[PDB]
Amino acid sequence: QSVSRAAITAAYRRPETEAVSMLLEQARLPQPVAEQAHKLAYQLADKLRNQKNASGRAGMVQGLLQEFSLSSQEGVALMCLAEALLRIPDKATRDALGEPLIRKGVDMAMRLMGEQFVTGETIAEALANARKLEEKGFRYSYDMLGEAALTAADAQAYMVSYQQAIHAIGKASNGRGIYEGPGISIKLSALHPRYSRAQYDRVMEELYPRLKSLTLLARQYDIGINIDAEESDRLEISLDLLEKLCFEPELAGWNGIGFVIQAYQKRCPLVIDYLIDLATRSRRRLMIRLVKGAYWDSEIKRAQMDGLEGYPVYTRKVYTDVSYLACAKKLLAVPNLIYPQFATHNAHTLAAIYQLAGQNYYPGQYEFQCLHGMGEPLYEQVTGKVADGKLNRPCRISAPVGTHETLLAYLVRRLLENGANTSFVNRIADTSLPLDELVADPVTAVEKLAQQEGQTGLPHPKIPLPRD
Amino acid sequence: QSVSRAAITAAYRRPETEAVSMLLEQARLPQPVAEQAHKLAYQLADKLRNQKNASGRAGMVQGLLQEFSLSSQEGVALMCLAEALLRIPDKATRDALGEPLIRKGVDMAMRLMGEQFVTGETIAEALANARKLEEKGFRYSYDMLGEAALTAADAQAYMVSYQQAIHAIGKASNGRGIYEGPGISIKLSALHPRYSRAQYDRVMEELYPRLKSLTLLARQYDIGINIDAEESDRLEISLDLLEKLCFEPELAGWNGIGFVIQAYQKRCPLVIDYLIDLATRSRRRLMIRLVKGAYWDSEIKRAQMDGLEGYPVYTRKVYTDVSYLACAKKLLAVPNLIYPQFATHNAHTLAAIYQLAGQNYYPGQYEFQCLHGMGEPLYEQVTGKVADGKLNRPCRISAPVGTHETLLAYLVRRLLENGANTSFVNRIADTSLPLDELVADPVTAVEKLAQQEGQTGLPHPKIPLPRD
Ligand SMILES: Cc1cc2nc3c(=O)[nH]c(=O)nc-3n(C[C@H](O)[C@H](O)[C@H](O)COP(=O)(O)OP(=O)(O)OCC3O[C@@H](n4cnc5c(N)ncnc54)[C@H](O)[C@@H]3O)c2cc1C
Ligand SMILES: Cc1cc2nc3c(=O)[nH]c(=O)nc-3n(C[C@H](O)[C@H](O)[C@H](O)COP(=O)(O)OP(=O)(O)OCC3O[C@@H](n4cnc5c(N)ncnc54)[C@H](O)[C@@H]3O)c2cc1C
Numbered sequence: 039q040s041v042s043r044a045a046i047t048a049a050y051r052r053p054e055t056e057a058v059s060m061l062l063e064q065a066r067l068p069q070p071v072a073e074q075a076h077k078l079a080y081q082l083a084d085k086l087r088n089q090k091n092a093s094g095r096a097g098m099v100q101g102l103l104q105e106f107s108l109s110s111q112e113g114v115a116l117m118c119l120a121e122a123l124l125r126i127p128d129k130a131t132r133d134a135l136g137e138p139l140i141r142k143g144v145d146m147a148m149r150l151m152g153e154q155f156v157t158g159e160t161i162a163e164a165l166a167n168a169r170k171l172e173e174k175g176f177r178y179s180y181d182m183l184g185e186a187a188l189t190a191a192d193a194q195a196y197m198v199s200y201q202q203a204i205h206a207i208g209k210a211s212n213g214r215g216i217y218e219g220p221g222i223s224i225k226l227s228a229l230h231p232r233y234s235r236a237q238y239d240r241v242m243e244e245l246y247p248r249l250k251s252l253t254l255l256a257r258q259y260d261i262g263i264n265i266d267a268e269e270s271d272r273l274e275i276s277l278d279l280l281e282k283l284c285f286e287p288e289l290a291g292w293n294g295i296g297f298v299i300q301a302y303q304k305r306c307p308l309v310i311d312y313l314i315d316l317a318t319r320s321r322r323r324l325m326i327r328l329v330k331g332a333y334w335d336s337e338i339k340r341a342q343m344d345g346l347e348g349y350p351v352y353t354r355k356v357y358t359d360v361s362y363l364a365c366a367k368k369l370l371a372v373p374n375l376i377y378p379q380f381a382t383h384n385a386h387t388l389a390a391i392y393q394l395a396g397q398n399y400y401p402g403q404y405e406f407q408c409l410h411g412m413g414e415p416l417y418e419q420v421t422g423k424v425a426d427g428k429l430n431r432p433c434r435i436s437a438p439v440g441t442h443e444t445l446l447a448y449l450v451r452r453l454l455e456n457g458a459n460t461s462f463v464n465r466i467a468d469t470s471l472p473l474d475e476l477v478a479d480p481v482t483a484v485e486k487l488a489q490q491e492g493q494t495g496l497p498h499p500k501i502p503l504p505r506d
Numbered sequence: 507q508s509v510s511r512a513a514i515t516a517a518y519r520r521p522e523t524e525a526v527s528m529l530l531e532q533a534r535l536p537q538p539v540a541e542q543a544h545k546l547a548y549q550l551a552d553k554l555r556n557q558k559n560a561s562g563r564a565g566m567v568q569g570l571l572q573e574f575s576l577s578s579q580e581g582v583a584l585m586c587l588a589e590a591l592l593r594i595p596d597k598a599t600r601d602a603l604g605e606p607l608i609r610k611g612v613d614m615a616m617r618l619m620g621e622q623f624v625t626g627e628t629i630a631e632a633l634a635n636a637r638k639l640e641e642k643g644f645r646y647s648y649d650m651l652g653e654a655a656l657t658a659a660d661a662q663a664y665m666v667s668y669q670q671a672i673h674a675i676g677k678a679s680n681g682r683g684i685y686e687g688p689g690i691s692i693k694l695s696a697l698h699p700r701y702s703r704a705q706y707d708r709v710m711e712e713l714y715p716r717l718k719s720l721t722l723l724a725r726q727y728d729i730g731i732n733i734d735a736e737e738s739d740r741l742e743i744s745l746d747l748l749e750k751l752c753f754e755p756e757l758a759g760w761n762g763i764g765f766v767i768q769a770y771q772k773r774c775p776l777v778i779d780y781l782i783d784l785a786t787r788s789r790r791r792l793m794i795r796l797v798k799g800a801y802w803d804s805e806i807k808r809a810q811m812d813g814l815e816g817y818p819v820y821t822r823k824v825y826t827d828v829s830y831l832a833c834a835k836k837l838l839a840v841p842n843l844i845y846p847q848f849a850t851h852n853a854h855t856l857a858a859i860y861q862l863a864g865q866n867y868y869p870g871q872y873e874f875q876c877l878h879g880m881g882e883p884l885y886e887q888v889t890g891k892v893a894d895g896k897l898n899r900p901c902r903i904s905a906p907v908g909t910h911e912t913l914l915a916y917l918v919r920r921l922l923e924n925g926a927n928t929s930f931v932n933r934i935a936d937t938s939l940p941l942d943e944l945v946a947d948p949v950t951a952v953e954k955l956a957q958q959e960g961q962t963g964l965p966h967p968k969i970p971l972p973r974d
């Protein structure tokens with residue numbers, strides 16, 4: 039392997055104490071920057087939590103819950119009485135006074151919960167809904183739902199769906215280009231049957247020509263085409279595919295190839311070193327989506343079953359946060375080689391990147407990204423005019439496109455993401471968690487754990503090594 | 507009295523059968539127009555009811571509620587099971603498996619429920635919030651809360667608050683003018699102590715100079731100034747004040763004087779005849795807000811206590827709807843004399859006015875109006891570009907300004923309006939009421955009642971004449 043590819047391989051499952059300790063100083067925000075990040079994060083989070091005065095109203099209730107020492111079901115009774123009294127029109131009057139059921143249930147629960155996350159049933163419908171936010175400075179990436187093709191027929195249908203989508207998105211883009219215009223994202227697992235266990239030779243013979251074909255088509259329309267990151271044991275083959283793609287003569291001088299990297303992997307910073315070298319060698323600017331990672335629960339389960347030396351992902355959420363910040367700095371350092379796209383719904387992460395990107399933002403420096411149904415509220419504070427009290431930073435919304443028949447896997451990942459006690463979007467909804475705790479700096483949090491536990495980067499107490 | 511003033515007086519409490527029968531043909535929409543009104547009303551109402559697919563989702567539930575014959579608490583249990591199952595990360599695993607308390611309570615209930623209806627605590631705060639919707643084509647009228655001044659000191663404080671508000675609104679308007687720019691609305695009951703029983707001479711000596719002063723100030727800034735309509739026994743004195751105001755030399759050639767008329771009053775069409783004559787004589791275009799009326803519950807109570815010959819308002823809601831349509835046609839007929847401002851949250855009423863206004867709309871022909879916290883959803887379909895799927899008709903939002911100390915009366919009127927089974931905004935939320943019933947034409951509804959009951963315009967069966 040090349041020097042950079044070899045380094046990736048060696049970092050695959052390196053001990054967490056080692057991995058985290060190495061990231062810490064790369065992730066640490068300079069005192070000035072950290073303060074500004076905190077203030078901005080606090081502000082974003084406060085505005086989000088207090089949208090319709092939710093907190094102000096809460097304070098009003100408790101202010102009476104004590105003046106009468108009433109229970110929850112008590113204060114409510116009083117409000118009910120007060121409401122009835124306020125409905126008296128005249129003040130004087132007021133004053134004076136089998137398995138199919140289970141299978142169907144899961145299917146329906148999936149669809150009801152999934153609606154919030156899906157932009158459209160078809161690409162035409164999705165694209166029709168774009169103007170509203172695009173006119174506000176938002177951008178879109180269309181995510182054709184459906185993954186892990188099991189059969190040759192399945193993969194072919196996905197291929198056809200991508201091609202049609204590119205034509206549609208490309209026509210809608212109308213030459214807006216890879217930055218301001220919409221793009222598409224693809225899953226390699228959709229393009230090859232049984233990708234999960236597919237061998238190198240067959241992937242190169244069969245998947246690659248499909249990847250190349252879609253990419254050439256995207257280039258014809260000048261839209262971004264992003265390669266999604268999936269399970270960790272497919273990282274290596276995805277890099278091999280990316281490597282080959284970047285050297286296609288027909289793509290020379292075109293910077294629309296995108297690639298996701300997952301900060302929850304120990305390999306992430308090493309993947310970045312490789313990508314930097316690849317952009318240099320292939321003479322392009324890569325569009326890189328930095329995400330934390332959507333498959334954590336499965337990654338942990340998988341590793342515990344394979345009984346290997348360790349995990350390919352961190353076991354404490356705060357370590358993934360630290361990894362993201364360290365990786366963000368690396369990406370921001372090389373604007374000639376990478377267009378960083380910072381996917382996050384986390385107010386601290388957003389504010390940290392905003393400060394790390396430095397003075398003198400220009401549109402092509404970077405963008406934020408979010409998932410439809412999750413990020414719009416946060417980014418409505420971010421994308422738009424400074425005069426309107428926004429940050430004037432672009433956000434690209436990932437917009438799922440598909441019917442109920444393709445929704446399951448995506449929906450499950452969203453449930454895990456939204457339901458996890460560790461998730462920012464879960465904690466922001468816990469009004470008992472103080473804002474300062476919510477937007478706490480991850481590097482400092484890691485150092486606090488280190489002082490308490492006796493060393494930096496210990497694994498989660500409840501997630502022992504697979505061999506234990 | 508003049509011919510027009512005399513006609514108003516004679517119509518004060520005319521029998522409902524007579525009043526309604528007289529309105530019917532003036533209100534009747536030409537077959538073509540009625541159909542277009544129905545289609546548009548249905549569309550507006552459907553989009554409002556189905557915002558986040560509320561109905562589509564409802565249909566999905568019942569589709570299973572029968573396939574298993576499950577109770578409400580039953581289907582819910584299944585969804586709960588399905589949700590837990592969908593939280594299993596790996597599919598294989600899933601598959602295999604005293605009076606102060608009362609006074610305080612009323613105060614707090616008032617404030618919690620009132621927030622949705624109040625734009626700002628102060629005029630500066632209110633004005634700061636205007637750009638968002640103004641940029642979308644909305645307009646504002648600021649409603650300084652506080653009415654029915656009891657003391658001289660009270661009225662003076664209201665007067666000062668209005669003056670300060672005009673300066674603020676006028677500065678914010680910045681010469682946008684009476685149509686495109688914000689205006690203010692005032693209550694005569696705020697400007698004179700014990701207005702409810704005030705005599706003509708004292709009102710002319712004391713209230714009028716205040717009204718004149720505010721109006722001259724509004725003219726200096728070229729903003730609209732609207733006289734609110736209050737209880738029915740103050741209609742006459744309000745007309746006397748308006749009459750005098752319209753002939754002030756300093757207001758000559760200025761068309762910013764506004765006046766509300768209430769369609770629920772039997773006098774409404776006669777007031778319009780008077781206003782038409784007044785605009786002609788005083789050589790101005792009057793800004794007229796046609797509203798249905800906010801004091802119905804109190805009007806009925808008042809009449810039943812005074813034991814008079816009849817009611818000054820209709821006793822069936824559908825009659826008020828008919829009155830509004832008849833009155834709207836009268837206003838639209840005289841664009842040189844009146845700028846009609848159609849206040850309503852009712853999709854049928856809106857659609858009917860839209861069609862009645864005819865072909866070749868121009869911005870200065872008319873506007874719609876709504877209350878903050880009630881009308882924005884409906885009018886988001888209306889104000890804005892045709893290309894964006896809107897109707898391109900302006901709506902002016904009435905924006906209450908004030909603290910909790912001035913909120914009570916306004917809030918109570920909003921509770922009655924929102925809570926009434928007869929209110930459009932209440933019925934649209936009743937998903938068991940078919941859309942077609944919701945947007946049913948009021949003239950046809952009245953004719954249906956007439957055929958069933960044996961004559962047109964009978965009073966509400968539950969609201970006998972006061973002397974009964
Ligand atoms: C536009 C877009 C494209 C995306 N593409 C991909 C993609 O191709 N592949 C993909 O994998 N994800 C992808 N993601 C999504 C992504 O990974 C999740 O949305 C993300 O991890 C949420 O991070 P956050 O900063 O919003 O929330 P945060 O609440 O701050 O962090 C959330 C998360 O931390 C991690 N985590 C949770 N618990 C632990 C733990 N105990 N130990 C270590 N880490 C933990 C997870 O990665 C997790 O999702 C994409 C997201 C967006 C917005
Ligand atoms: C910008 C603005 C300014 C306003 N200014 C004033 C004002 O100065 N004075 C004022 O009085 N109102 C004023 N109103 C408000 C107003 O009168 C109510 O908002 C209104 O009546 C609601 O009508 P609607 O078409 O939205 O609802 P709809 O549901 O179609 O009709 C509602 C109503 O019909 C009436 N009604 C209810 N029951 C009966 C019945 N049994 N018999 C007869 N009629 C019945 C009422 O007038 C009532 O509010 C204003 C409203 C707005 C938007």
Ligand SMILES: O=C(O)[C@@H]1C[C@@H](O)CN1
Pocket residue numbers: 181223266267332409436448451
């Ligand atoms: O599948 C997922 O969970 C993420 C989100 C999308 O952008 C696609 N990759």
Ligand SMILES: O=C(O)[C@@H]1C[C@@H](O)CN1
Pocket residue numbers: 649691734735800877904916919
């Ligand atoms: O007081 C009311 O109820 C109405 C609404 C405002 O426009 C003022 N008049």
